[PDB]
PDB file of C-alpha atoms and ligand atoms in Angstrom:
ATOM      1  CA  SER A   1      15.405 -33.318  55.632  1.00 17.61           C
ATOM      2  CA  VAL A   2      11.939 -31.790  55.251  1.00 16.11           C
ATOM      3  CA  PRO A   3       9.713 -32.909  52.345  1.00 12.96           C
ATOM      4  CA  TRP A   4       8.102 -30.245  50.143  1.00 11.34           C
ATOM      5  CA  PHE A   5       4.931 -28.590  51.416  1.00 12.91           C
ATOM      6  CA  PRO A   6       2.844 -25.623  50.203  1.00 15.39           C
ATOM      7  CA  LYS A   7       3.805 -22.218  51.608  1.00 14.51           C
ATOM      8  CA  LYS A   8       0.846 -20.380  50.107  1.00 16.32           C
ATOM      9  CA  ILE A   9      -2.651 -21.212  48.838  1.00 19.24           C
ATOM     10  CA  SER A  10      -1.573 -21.151  45.179  1.00 19.10           C
ATOM     11  CA  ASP A  11       1.136 -23.759  45.817  1.00 15.41           C
ATOM     12  CA  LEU A  12      -1.601 -26.413  45.947  1.00 13.87           C
ATOM     13  CA  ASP A  13      -1.430 -26.516  42.133  1.00 17.54           C
ATOM     14  CA  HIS A  14       1.639 -28.735  42.477  1.00 17.17           C
ATOM     15  CA  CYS A  15       0.000 -31.443  44.614  1.00 18.67           C
ATOM     16  CA  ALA A  16      -3.677 -31.511  43.569  1.00 19.41           C
ATOM     17  CA  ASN A  17      -3.082 -33.766  40.541  1.00 21.06           C
ATOM     18  CA  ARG A  18      -2.155 -37.010  42.324  1.00 20.52           C
ATOM     19  CA  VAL A  19      -3.942 -40.323  41.732  1.00 22.26           C
ATOM     20  CA  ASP A  20     -20.438 -49.132  32.118  1.00 24.21           C
ATOM     21  CA  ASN A  21     -19.374 -47.218  28.994  1.00 23.51           C
ATOM     22  CA  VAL A  22     -21.277 -43.944  29.384  1.00 21.09           C
ATOM     23  CA  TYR A  23     -20.339 -43.643  33.064  1.00 22.62           C
ATOM     24  CA  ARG A  24     -16.608 -44.059  32.393  1.00 21.56           C
ATOM     25  CA  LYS A  25     -16.506 -41.209  29.876  1.00 20.62           C
ATOM     26  CA  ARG A  26     -18.529 -39.133  32.327  1.00 21.23           C
ATOM     27  CA  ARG A  27     -16.010 -39.890  35.084  1.00 17.21           C
ATOM     28  CA  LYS A  28     -13.067 -39.050  32.827  1.00 17.25           C
ATOM     29  CA  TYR A  29     -14.833 -35.784  32.003  1.00 15.17           C
ATOM     30  CA  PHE A  30     -14.953 -34.744  35.663  1.00 11.88           C
ATOM     31  CA  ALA A  31     -11.353 -35.863  36.156  1.00 11.80           C
ATOM     32  CA  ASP A  32     -10.262 -33.692  33.225  1.00 11.62           C
ATOM     33  CA  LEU A  33     -11.958 -30.633  34.720  1.00 10.37           C
ATOM     34  CA  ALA A  34     -10.164 -31.067  38.045  1.00 16.75           C
ATOM     35  CA  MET A  35      -6.800 -31.840  36.449  1.00 16.01           C
ATOM     36  CA  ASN A  36      -6.751 -28.630  34.401  1.00 17.93           C
ATOM     37  CA  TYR A  37      -7.947 -26.499  37.312  1.00 14.24           C
ATOM     38  CA  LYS A  38      -5.534 -23.873  38.635  1.00 14.81           C
ATOM     39  CA  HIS A  39      -5.792 -21.731  41.769  1.00 14.64           C
ATOM     40  CA  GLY A  40      -7.738 -18.534  41.137  1.00 15.98           C
ATOM     41  CA  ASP A  41      -9.898 -20.110  38.452  1.00 17.43           C
ATOM     42  CA  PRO A  42     -13.630 -20.217  39.054  1.00 17.34           C
ATOM     43  CA  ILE A  43     -14.643 -23.840  39.623  1.00 18.23           C
ATOM     44  CA  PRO A  44     -16.164 -24.958  36.285  1.00 20.22           C
ATOM     45  CA  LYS A  45     -19.960 -25.096  36.393  1.00 25.45           C
ATOM     46  CA  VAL A  46     -21.362 -28.477  35.415  1.00 23.37           C
ATOM     47  CA  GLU A  47     -24.703 -29.447  33.899  1.00 22.99           C
ATOM     48  CA  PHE A  48     -25.539 -32.670  35.721  1.00 19.46           C
ATOM     49  CA  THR A  49     -27.586 -35.326  33.941  1.00 19.34           C
ATOM     50  CA  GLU A  50     -31.040 -36.355  35.142  1.00 22.18           C
ATOM     51  CA  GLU A  51     -29.747 -39.730  36.341  1.00 23.53           C
ATOM     52  CA  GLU A  52     -27.119 -37.877  38.362  1.00 25.38           C
ATOM     53  CA  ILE A  53     -29.710 -35.405  39.649  1.00 26.17           C
ATOM     54  CA  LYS A  54     -32.110 -38.253  40.470  1.00 26.32           C
ATOM     55  CA  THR A  55     -29.266 -39.996  42.304  1.00 25.80           C
ATOM     56  CA  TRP A  56     -28.500 -36.850  44.292  1.00 27.21           C
ATOM     57  CA  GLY A  57     -32.224 -36.384  44.831  1.00 26.24           C
ATOM     58  CA  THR A  58     -32.595 -39.891  46.246  1.00 26.32           C
ATOM     59  CA  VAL A  59     -29.660 -39.605  48.659  1.00 23.16           C
ATOM     60  CA  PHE A  60     -30.558 -36.020  49.633  1.00 21.32           C
ATOM     61  CA  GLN A  61     -34.230 -36.835  50.240  1.00 18.47           C
ATOM     62  CA  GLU A  62     -33.531 -39.903  52.379  1.00 21.34           C
ATOM     63  CA  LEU A  63     -30.672 -38.394  54.403  1.00 21.00           C
ATOM     64  CA  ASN A  64     -32.838 -35.402  55.320  1.00 23.93           C
ATOM     65  CA  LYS A  65     -35.204 -37.870  56.970  1.00 26.70           C
ATOM     66  CA  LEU A  66     -32.340 -39.006  59.208  1.00 30.02           C
ATOM     67  CA  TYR A  67     -30.498 -35.744  59.933  1.00 30.42           C
ATOM     68  CA  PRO A  68     -32.861 -34.333  62.604  1.00 30.58           C
ATOM     69  CA  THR A  69     -32.409 -37.436  64.781  1.00 33.04           C
ATOM     70  CA  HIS A  70     -28.820 -38.278  63.816  1.00 34.82           C
ATOM     71  CA  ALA A  71     -26.858 -35.158  62.854  1.00 37.32           C
ATOM     72  CA  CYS A  72     -25.193 -32.819  65.351  1.00 34.66           C
ATOM     73  CA  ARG A  73     -26.746 -29.430  66.149  1.00 39.28           C
ATOM     74  CA  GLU A  74     -24.150 -27.527  64.096  1.00 37.27           C
ATOM     75  CA  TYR A  75     -24.930 -29.601  61.003  1.00 36.14           C
ATOM     76  CA  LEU A  76     -28.658 -28.972  61.403  1.00 34.97           C
ATOM     77  CA  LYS A  77     -27.880 -25.290  61.961  1.00 35.60           C
ATOM     78  CA  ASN A  78     -25.960 -24.682  58.733  1.00 35.54           C
ATOM     79  CA  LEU A  79     -27.762 -27.083  56.383  1.00 36.66           C
ATOM     80  CA  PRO A  80     -30.745 -24.752  55.860  1.00 36.42           C
ATOM     81  CA  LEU A  81     -28.287 -21.936  55.107  1.00 37.50           C
ATOM     82  CA  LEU A  82     -26.958 -24.009  52.207  1.00 37.51           C
ATOM     83  CA  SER A  83     -30.428 -24.620  50.783  1.00 42.94           C
ATOM     84  CA  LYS A  84     -31.208 -20.903  50.942  1.00 43.91           C
ATOM     85  CA  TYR A  85     -27.976 -19.696  49.335  1.00 42.89           C
ATOM     86  CA  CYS A  86     -26.405 -22.596  47.427  1.00 43.20           C
ATOM     87  CA  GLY A  87     -29.419 -24.304  45.869  1.00 45.01           C
ATOM     88  CA  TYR A  88     -29.520 -27.512  47.906  1.00 46.24           C
ATOM     89  CA  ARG A  89     -32.591 -29.261  46.483  1.00 42.46           C
ATOM     90  CA  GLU A  90     -33.855 -32.689  45.455  1.00 45.16           C
ATOM     91  CA  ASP A  91     -34.026 -31.528  41.836  1.00 45.86           C
ATOM     92  CA  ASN A  92     -30.759 -29.585  41.840  1.00 48.64           C
ATOM     93  CA  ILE A  93     -27.129 -30.498  42.453  1.00 51.36           C
ATOM     94  CA  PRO A  94     -25.255 -27.528  43.989  1.00 52.88           C
ATOM     95  CA  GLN A  95     -22.235 -26.171  42.110  1.00 50.55           C
ATOM     96  CA  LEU A  96     -18.831 -26.439  43.790  1.00 51.63           C
ATOM     97  CA  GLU A  97     -18.148 -22.808  42.874  1.00 54.15           C
ATOM     98  CA  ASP A  98     -21.253 -21.498  44.647  1.00 54.13           C
ATOM     99  CA  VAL A  99     -20.708 -23.396  47.905  1.00 56.33           C
ATOM    100  CA  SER A 100     -17.024 -22.431  47.773  1.00 61.38           C
ATOM    101  CA  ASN A 101     -18.037 -18.771  47.624  1.00 61.18           C
ATOM    102  CA  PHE A 102     -20.404 -19.407  50.528  1.00 62.96           C
ATOM    103  CA  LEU A 103     -17.660 -20.974  52.651  1.00 62.10           C
ATOM    104  CA  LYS A 104     -15.394 -18.006  51.918  1.00 63.20           C
ATOM    105  CA  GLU A 105     -17.885 -15.612  53.513  1.00 63.22           C
ATOM    106  CA  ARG A 106     -18.617 -17.962  56.406  1.00 62.81           C
ATOM    107  CA  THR A 107     -15.296 -19.493  57.469  1.00 60.68           C
ATOM    108  CA  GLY A 108     -12.806 -18.459  54.799  1.00 60.40           C
ATOM    109  CA  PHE A 109     -12.724 -22.039  53.548  1.00 60.83           C
ATOM    110  CA  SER A 110     -12.657 -22.689  49.809  1.00 61.60           C
ATOM    111  CA  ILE A 111     -13.131 -25.639  47.481  1.00 59.60           C
ATOM    112  CA  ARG A 112     -10.744 -27.094  44.901  1.00 56.13           C
ATOM    113  CA  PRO A 113     -12.013 -29.672  42.421  1.00 54.60           C
ATOM    114  CA  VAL A 114     -10.027 -32.908  42.609  1.00 52.40           C
ATOM    115  CA  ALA A 115     -10.027 -35.929  40.292  1.00 54.22           C
ATOM    116  CA  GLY A 116      -9.795 -38.527  43.049  1.00 53.30           C
ATOM    117  CA  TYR A 117      -7.829 -39.527  46.134  1.00 50.45           C
ATOM    118  CA  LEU A 118      -4.821 -37.443  47.093  1.00 48.24           C
ATOM    119  CA  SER A 119      -2.138 -38.591  49.511  1.00 45.50           C
ATOM    120  CA  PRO A 120      -3.040 -37.733  53.121  1.00 49.87           C
ATOM    121  CA  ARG A 121      -0.103 -35.299  53.198  1.00 48.03           C
ATOM    122  CA  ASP A 122      -1.269 -33.413  50.102  1.00 46.80           C
ATOM    123  CA  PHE A 123      -4.893 -33.440  51.250  1.00 45.55           C
ATOM    124  CA  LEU A 124      -4.137 -32.234  54.778  1.00 45.33           C
ATOM    125  CA  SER A 125      -1.792 -29.616  53.314  1.00 43.42           C
ATOM    126  CA  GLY A 126      -4.838 -28.121  51.611  1.00 44.57           C
ATOM    127  CA  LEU A 127      -6.646 -27.838  54.944  1.00 45.40           C
ATOM    128  CA  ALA A 128      -3.733 -25.773  56.269  1.00 43.80           C
ATOM    129  CA  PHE A 129      -4.858 -23.011  53.912  1.00 46.29           C
ATOM    130  CA  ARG A 130      -8.532 -23.803  54.524  1.00 46.05           C
ATOM    131  CA  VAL A 131      -8.901 -25.455  51.124  1.00 47.29           C
ATOM    132  CA  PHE A 132     -11.019 -28.587  50.791  1.00 46.33           C
ATOM    133  CA  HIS A 133     -10.368 -30.842  47.801  1.00 45.89           C
ATOM    134  CA  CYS A 134     -13.738 -31.998  46.461  1.00 45.48           C
ATOM    135  CA  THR A 135     -14.802 -34.583  43.906  1.00 44.21           C
ATOM    136  CA  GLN A 136     -17.231 -33.222  41.330  1.00 48.54           C
ATOM    137  CA  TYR A 137     -18.820 -36.408  39.977  1.00 47.26           C
ATOM    138  CA  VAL A 138     -21.934 -38.159  41.277  1.00 49.57           C
ATOM    139  CA  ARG A 139     -21.991 -41.743  42.575  1.00 50.10           C
ATOM    140  CA  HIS A 140     -23.243 -44.552  40.339  1.00 49.85           C
ATOM    141  CA  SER A 141     -27.026 -44.997  40.348  1.00 49.85           C
ATOM    142  CA  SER A 142     -26.745 -48.678  41.339  1.00 54.29           C
ATOM    143  CA  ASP A 143     -26.155 -47.895  45.014  1.00 54.08           C
ATOM    144  CA  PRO A 144     -27.081 -44.417  46.329  1.00 52.64           C
ATOM    145  CA  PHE A 145     -27.088 -45.740  49.902  1.00 54.05           C
ATOM    146  CA  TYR A 146     -23.329 -46.328  49.949  1.00 52.78           C
ATOM    147  CA  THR A 147     -20.288 -45.794  47.725  1.00 53.62           C
ATOM    148  CA  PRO A 148     -16.690 -47.039  48.212  1.00 47.56           C
ATOM    149  CA  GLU A 149     -15.264 -43.641  47.218  1.00 46.59           C
ATOM    150  CA  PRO A 150     -16.046 -39.929  47.631  1.00 45.31           C
ATOM    151  CA  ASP A 151     -18.489 -38.305  45.225  1.00 44.72           C
ATOM    152  CA  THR A 152     -19.922 -34.789  45.031  1.00 46.91           C
ATOM    153  CA  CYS A 153     -22.787 -35.928  47.284  1.00 46.92           C
ATOM    154  CA  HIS A 154     -20.287 -36.840  49.997  1.00 45.52           C
ATOM    155  CA  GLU A 155     -18.596 -33.455  49.717  1.00 46.28           C
ATOM    156  CA  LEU A 156     -21.780 -31.364  49.576  1.00 48.72           C
ATOM    157  CA  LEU A 157     -23.883 -33.188  52.176  1.00 49.38           C
ATOM    158  CA  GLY A 158     -21.110 -34.563  54.373  1.00 54.54           C
ATOM    159  CA  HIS A 159     -18.342 -31.966  54.521  1.00 49.80           C
ATOM    160  CA  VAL A 160     -19.693 -28.576  53.411  1.00 48.41           C
ATOM    161  CA  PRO A 161     -22.283 -27.955  56.170  1.00 45.19           C
ATOM    162  CA  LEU A 162     -19.699 -28.366  58.951  1.00 44.17           C
ATOM    163  CA  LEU A 163     -16.994 -26.442  57.086  1.00 46.01           C
ATOM    164  CA  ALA A 164     -19.379 -23.499  57.464  1.00 44.53           C
ATOM    165  CA  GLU A 165     -18.986 -23.814  61.240  1.00 43.36           C
ATOM    166  CA  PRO A 166     -16.132 -21.631  62.614  1.00 44.17           C
ATOM    167  CA  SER A 167     -15.201 -24.023  65.432  1.00 41.89           C
ATOM    168  CA  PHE A 168     -15.108 -26.976  63.034  1.00 44.28           C
ATOM    169  CA  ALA A 169     -13.337 -24.865  60.407  1.00 40.49           C
ATOM    170  CA  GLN A 170     -10.605 -24.073  62.927  1.00 38.31           C
ATOM    171  CA  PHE A 171     -10.363 -27.739  63.940  1.00 37.27           C
ATOM    172  CA  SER A 172      -9.877 -28.859  60.336  1.00 36.59           C
ATOM    173  CA  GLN A 173      -7.212 -26.264  59.517  1.00 34.59           C
ATOM    174  CA  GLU A 174      -5.188 -27.022  62.650  1.00 35.46           C
ATOM    175  CA  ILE A 175      -5.001 -30.671  61.623  1.00 33.79           C
ATOM    176  CA  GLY A 176      -3.785 -29.391  58.269  1.00 37.95           C
ATOM    177  CA  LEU A 177      -1.354 -26.903  59.798  1.00 38.12           C
ATOM    178  CA  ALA A 178       0.053 -29.691  61.969  1.00 38.67           C
ATOM    179  CA  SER A 179       0.601 -31.814  58.864  1.00 38.92           C
ATOM    180  CA  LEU A 180       2.767 -29.257  57.046  1.00 38.91           C
ATOM    181  CA  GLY A 181       6.268 -30.648  56.577  1.00 41.44           C
ATOM    182  CA  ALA A 182       5.613 -33.236  59.278  1.00 41.27           C
ATOM    183  CA  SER A 183       7.195 -36.692  59.230  1.00 43.31           C
ATOM    184  CA  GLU A 184       5.506 -39.559  57.375  1.00 42.91           C
ATOM    185  CA  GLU A 185       4.630 -41.171  60.709  1.00 40.77           C
ATOM    186  CA  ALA A 186       3.156 -37.908  61.992  1.00 40.81           C
ATOM    187  CA  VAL A 187       1.080 -37.315  58.854  1.00 40.02           C
ATOM    188  CA  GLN A 188      -0.434 -40.809  59.059  1.00 40.27           C
ATOM    189  CA  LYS A 189      -1.280 -40.328  62.738  1.00 42.62           C
ATOM    190  CA  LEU A 190      -2.927 -37.013  61.876  1.00 41.26           C
ATOM    191  CA  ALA A 191      -4.657 -38.625  58.896  1.00 41.78           C
ATOM    192  CA  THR A 192      -6.158 -41.294  61.155  1.00 45.69           C
ATOM    193  CA  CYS A 193      -7.339 -38.724  63.702  1.00 47.17           C
ATOM    194  CA  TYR A 194      -8.817 -36.727  60.819  1.00 47.31           C
ATOM    195  CA  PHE A 195     -10.514 -39.902  59.582  1.00 47.24           C
ATOM    196  CA  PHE A 196     -12.233 -40.744  62.872  1.00 48.55           C
ATOM    197  CA  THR A 197     -13.363 -37.167  63.455  1.00 49.09           C
ATOM    198  CA  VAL A 198     -14.014 -35.235  60.247  1.00 51.40           C
ATOM    199  CA  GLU A 199     -14.981 -38.279  58.176  1.00 51.84           C
ATOM    200  CA  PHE A 200     -16.383 -40.756  60.712  1.00 53.65           C
ATOM    201  CA  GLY A 201     -16.624 -38.951  64.050  1.00 55.34           C
ATOM    202  CA  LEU A 202     -19.394 -39.026  66.637  1.00 53.47           C
ATOM    203  CA  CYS A 203     -20.151 -36.345  69.223  1.00 54.44           C
ATOM    204  CA  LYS A 204     -22.011 -36.103  72.529  1.00 53.38           C
ATOM    205  CA  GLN A 205     -24.654 -33.372  72.699  1.00 56.39           C
ATOM    206  CA  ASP A 206     -27.122 -33.065  75.587  1.00 52.07           C
ATOM    207  CA  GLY A 207     -26.270 -36.626  76.591  1.00 51.14           C
ATOM    208  CA  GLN A 208     -27.014 -37.943  73.108  1.00 51.50           C
ATOM    209  CA  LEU A 209     -24.732 -39.462  70.485  1.00 49.96           C
ATOM    210  CA  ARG A 210     -24.796 -37.388  67.302  1.00 52.90           C
ATOM    211  CA  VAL A 211     -23.034 -37.657  63.958  1.00 55.63           C
ATOM    212  CA  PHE A 212     -20.627 -35.104  62.510  1.00 52.58           C
ATOM    213  CA  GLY A 213     -18.557 -37.556  60.480  1.00 49.52           C
ATOM    214  CA  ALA A 214     -18.794 -36.537  56.827  1.00 52.44           C
ATOM    215  CA  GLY A 215     -18.486 -40.104  55.548  1.00 53.02           C
ATOM    216  CA  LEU A 216     -21.413 -40.989  57.795  1.00 51.79           C
ATOM    217  CA  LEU A 217     -23.586 -37.952  57.030  1.00 55.03           C
ATOM    218  CA  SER A 218     -23.560 -38.751  53.308  1.00 55.16           C
ATOM    219  CA  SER A 219     -24.234 -42.474  53.637  1.00 53.43           C
ATOM    220  CA  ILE A 220     -27.853 -43.466  54.266  1.00 55.79           C
ATOM    221  CA  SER A 221     -26.983 -46.960  55.467  1.00 51.87           C
ATOM    222  CA  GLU A 222     -23.972 -46.235  57.683  1.00 52.85           C
ATOM    223  CA  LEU A 223     -25.570 -43.145  59.252  1.00 56.90           C
ATOM    224  CA  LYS A 224     -28.311 -45.392  60.613  1.00 58.48           C
ATOM    225  CA  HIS A 225     -25.728 -48.047  61.483  1.00 57.81           C
ATOM    226  CA  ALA A 226     -23.552 -45.628  63.468  1.00 56.80           C
ATOM    227  CA  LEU A 227     -26.300 -44.709  65.949  1.00 54.61           C
ATOM    228  CA  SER A 228     -28.124 -48.051  65.843  1.00 54.66           C
ATOM    229  CA  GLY A 229     -26.356 -49.309  68.962  1.00 54.05           C
ATOM    230  CA  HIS A 230     -24.847 -52.251  67.103  1.00 54.73           C
ATOM    231  CA  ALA A 231     -21.658 -50.252  66.526  1.00 53.32           C
ATOM    232  CA  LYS A 232     -18.509 -50.145  68.660  1.00 51.24           C
ATOM    233  CA  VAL A 233     -17.938 -46.828  70.424  1.00 52.34           C
ATOM    234  CA  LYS A 234     -14.833 -45.383  72.099  1.00 53.12           C
ATOM    235  CA  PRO A 235     -13.941 -41.956  73.507  1.00 54.28           C
ATOM    236  CA  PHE A 236     -11.862 -39.817  71.143  1.00 55.34           C
ATOM    237  CA  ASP A 237      -8.257 -39.965  72.323  1.00 58.53           C
ATOM    238  CA  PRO A 238      -5.641 -39.012  69.696  1.00 61.96           C
ATOM    239  CA  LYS A 239      -2.869 -41.291  71.012  1.00 62.29           C
ATOM    240  CA  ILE A 240      -5.242 -44.268  70.886  1.00 62.48           C
ATOM    241  CA  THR A 241      -7.440 -43.135  67.984  1.00 61.57           C
ATOM    242  CA  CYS A 242      -4.443 -42.701  65.656  1.00 63.84           C
ATOM    243  CA  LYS A 243      -3.604 -46.386  66.083  1.00 64.94           C
ATOM    244  CA  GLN A 244      -6.938 -47.515  64.636  1.00 62.14           C
ATOM    245  CA  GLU A 245      -7.054 -48.996  61.130  1.00 60.05           C
ATOM    246  CA  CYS A 246      -9.046 -47.031  58.545  1.00 63.79           C
ATOM    247  CA  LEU A 247     -11.351 -49.232  56.465  1.00 64.19           C
ATOM    248  CA  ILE A 248     -12.595 -48.594  52.925  1.00 64.62           C
ATOM    249  CA  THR A 249     -15.558 -50.050  50.987  1.00 64.72           C
ATOM    250  CA  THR A 250     -17.090 -51.089  54.317  1.00 65.34           C
ATOM    251  CA  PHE A 251     -18.652 -49.732  57.481  1.00 62.80           C
ATOM    252  CA  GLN A 252     -16.120 -48.786  60.148  1.00 63.24           C
ATOM    253  CA  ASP A 253     -15.495 -51.350  62.892  1.00 62.46           C
ATOM    254  CA  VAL A 254     -15.444 -48.665  65.582  1.00 62.80           C
ATOM    255  CA  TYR A 255     -16.455 -45.017  65.997  1.00 58.64           C
ATOM    256  CA  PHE A 256     -14.854 -42.396  68.239  1.00 58.92           C
ATOM    257  CA  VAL A 257     -16.843 -39.892  70.296  1.00 63.75           C
ATOM    258  CA  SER A 258     -15.616 -36.346  70.883  1.00 61.61           C
ATOM    259  CA  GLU A 259     -17.082 -34.153  73.621  1.00 61.60           C
ATOM    260  CA  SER A 260     -17.174 -31.205  71.217  1.00 61.34           C
ATOM    261  CA  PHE A 261     -15.351 -29.643  68.263  1.00 59.94           C
ATOM    262  CA  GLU A 262     -13.296 -27.408  70.554  1.00 59.02           C
ATOM    263  CA  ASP A 263     -12.639 -30.446  72.736  1.00 56.86           C
ATOM    264  CA  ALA A 264     -11.442 -32.418  69.716  1.00 54.18           C
ATOM    265  CA  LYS A 265      -9.375 -29.368  68.774  1.00 54.46           C
ATOM    266  CA  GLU A 266      -7.734 -29.142  72.207  1.00 49.15           C
ATOM    267  CA  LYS A 267      -6.978 -32.869  72.284  1.00 50.87           C
ATOM    268  CA  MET A 268      -5.314 -32.525  68.880  1.00 48.97           C
ATOM    269  CA  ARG A 269      -3.211 -29.523  69.925  1.00 46.57           C
ATOM    270  CA  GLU A 270      -1.882 -31.567  72.825  1.00 48.30           C
ATOM    271  CA  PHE A 271      -1.232 -34.518  70.502  1.00 51.22           C
ATOM    272  CA  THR A 272       0.588 -32.671  67.707  1.00 48.19           C
ATOM    273  CA  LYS A 273       3.224 -31.482  70.162  1.00 48.50           C
ATOM    274  CA  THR A 274       4.021 -35.113  71.010  1.00 46.98           C
ATOM    275  CA  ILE A 275       4.787 -35.906  67.361  1.00 52.08           C
TER     276      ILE A 275
HETATM  277  C1  LIG B   1      -4.429 -42.980  57.435  1.00 51.89           C
HETATM  278  C2  LIG B   1      -5.321 -42.472  56.187  1.00 51.89           C
HETATM  279  C3  LIG B   1      -6.245 -41.394  56.189  1.00 51.89           C
HETATM  280  C4  LIG B   1      -6.766 -41.352  54.857  1.00 51.89           C
HETATM  281  N1  LIG B   1      -6.181 -42.328  54.185  1.00 51.89           N
HETATM  282  C5  LIG B   1      -6.430 -42.654  52.746  1.00 51.89           C
HETATM  283  C6  LIG B   1      -5.502 -42.262  51.771  1.00 51.89           C
HETATM  284  C7  LIG B   1      -5.723 -42.562  50.431  1.00 51.89           C
HETATM  285 CL1  LIG B   1      -4.561 -42.067  49.218  1.00 51.89          CL
HETATM  286  C8  LIG B   1      -6.859 -43.252  50.054  1.00 51.89           C
HETATM  287  C9  LIG B   1      -7.801 -43.652  51.035  1.00 51.89           C
HETATM  288  C10 LIG B   1      -7.581 -43.356  52.371  1.00 51.89           C
HETATM  289  C11 LIG B   1      -8.664 -43.817  53.475  1.00 51.89           C
HETATM  290  O1  LIG B   1      -9.878 -43.984  52.877  1.00 51.89           O
HETATM  291  C12 LIG B   1     -10.742 -42.852  52.966  1.00 51.89           C
HETATM  292  C13 LIG B   1     -12.047 -42.927  52.533  1.00 51.89           C
HETATM  293  C14 LIG B   1     -12.856 -41.775  52.645  1.00 51.89           C
HETATM  294  C15 LIG B   1     -14.372 -41.802  52.163  1.00 51.89           C
HETATM  295  C16 LIG B   1     -15.318 -41.030  52.824  1.00 51.89           C
HETATM  296  C17 LIG B   1     -16.648 -41.053  52.403  1.00 51.89           C
HETATM  297  C18 LIG B   1     -17.017 -41.840  51.339  1.00 51.89           C
HETATM  298  C19 LIG B   1     -18.516 -41.865  50.860  1.00 51.89           C
HETATM  299  C20 LIG B   1     -19.447 -42.703  51.834  1.00 51.89           C
HETATM  300  N2  LIG B   1     -18.963 -44.021  51.927  1.00 51.89           N
HETATM  301  C21 LIG B   1     -20.857 -42.719  51.277  1.00 51.89           C
HETATM  302  O2  LIG B   1     -21.452 -43.837  51.070  1.00 51.89           O
HETATM  303  O3  LIG B   1     -21.436 -41.635  51.017  1.00 51.89           O
HETATM  304  C22 LIG B   1     -16.056 -42.618  50.676  1.00 51.89           C
HETATM  305  C23 LIG B   1     -14.748 -42.595  51.089  1.00 51.89           C
HETATM  306  N3  LIG B   1     -12.351 -40.683  53.147  1.00 51.89           N
HETATM  307  C24 LIG B   1     -11.102 -40.651  53.547  1.00 51.89           C
HETATM  308  N4  LIG B   1     -10.578 -39.455  54.088  1.00 51.89           N
HETATM  309  N5  LIG B   1     -10.306 -41.729  53.455  1.00 51.89           N
HETATM  310  C25 LIG B   1      -8.257 -45.137  54.129  1.00 51.89           C
HETATM  311  F1  LIG B   1      -7.825 -46.002  53.182  1.00 51.89           F
HETATM  312  F2  LIG B   1      -7.277 -44.925  55.032  1.00 51.89           F
HETATM  313  F3  LIG B   1      -9.372 -45.695  54.792  1.00 51.89           F
HETATM  314  N6  LIG B   1      -5.320 -42.993  54.965  1.00 51.89           N
HETATM  315 FE1   FE B   2     -14.579 -36.828  52.877  1.00 49.26          FE
END
């Protein structure tokens, strides 16, 4: 029989809640905000602390040094749009509500604040309705270069700029749409393909390797590592790519290169029929 899946955007209420002293209370605070959030609510505006803003400022400042030579053209295209409309600055952390409103005008995507990791099924189910579950907290100040879990920096600098791109927006949703009510095996295959594209993908533009992986675009160290030449590279092929192990708390052992977003989209459409 078919497992439960959302049939409308508001149904995501039923799946979004899955799962240093001052930092812990701060983290619980953000978790509480996401937990009590219901569809239709404005995403609660948060006054970030200076340490959090300085952390964002450090990551943001350093990544912007790398983006022109590392990021794909679409990322570099939409990133200034975010700084002109959503307050992307070194001294200011953008609000999830504002960028969500921006995405609505651009690609119809929206943001939903989430406490932490959701199951791949629940997360991909959100994409089916062009909803991206975002963490609202900032990474610990100890290591701004890399963090073993998503933070608001990862969402805002990694995911948001490409979600504003129609071709990429379509690609993301179709992965989500494919996931709806799919078998456990199918969801995991889709989740792995999502992982090595949306989160850690590489693309070929004008003969050059560029980064569109969100997990890469928000990590100072791995972004450099991905294009250094010391990394393992393979062509994106869903049947093969979906068999690759997804690593956490570390750099990936291999990266997959797509020809383009529409190319990645077409390869996925072919693949989802097989499963
Ligand atoms: C098959 C499949 C697909 C997904 N999953 C899965 C399921 C659950 Cl419930 C938990 C964990 C995972 C996967 O882990 C991650 C991690 C991240 C991630 C991205 C960026 C950053 C910040 C960056 N390092 C920075 O420094 O900015 C952090 C984390 N993103 C995703 N989508 N998955 C895992 F475990 F498979 F790898 N499984
Ligand atoms: Fe992510």
